[PDB]
């Protein structure tokens, strides 16, 4: 049996790291950007 699953990915515009789901990237952006 397979060790995991892959498909369409989501890429960080700041460090070029890739993720499997949109919310995984959007939460990673909080190290690169801020909000007030
Ligand atoms: Zn990043």
Swiss-Prot record:
Isoform 1 is strongly expressed in placenta, spleen, kidney, testis and peripheral blood leukocytes. Expressed in CD4+ and CD8+ T-cells, CD19+ B-cells and CB14+ monocytes. Isoform 3 is strongly expressed in placenta, ovary, tonsil, CD19+ B-cells and CD14+ monocytes. The gene is ZFAT. Zn(2+) 1 binds at residues 12, 15, 28, 32. May be involved in transcriptional regulation. Overexpression causes down-regulation of a number of genes involved in the immune response. Some genes are also up-regulated. This is Zinc finger protein ZFAT. It is found in: Nucleus; Cytoplasm, Cytosol. The chain holds residues 269 to 297 of 1243 of the full protein. It comes from the Eukaryota. The lineage of its organism: Eukaryota, Metazoa, Chordata, Craniata, Vertebrata. A zinc finger (C2H2-type) spans 10-32.
């Amino acid at each position: 049996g397979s060790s995991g699953s892959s498909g369409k990915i989501f890429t960080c515009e700041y460090c070029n790291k890739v993720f499997k789901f949109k919310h995984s990237l959007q939460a990673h952006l909080r190290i690169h950007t801020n909000e007030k």
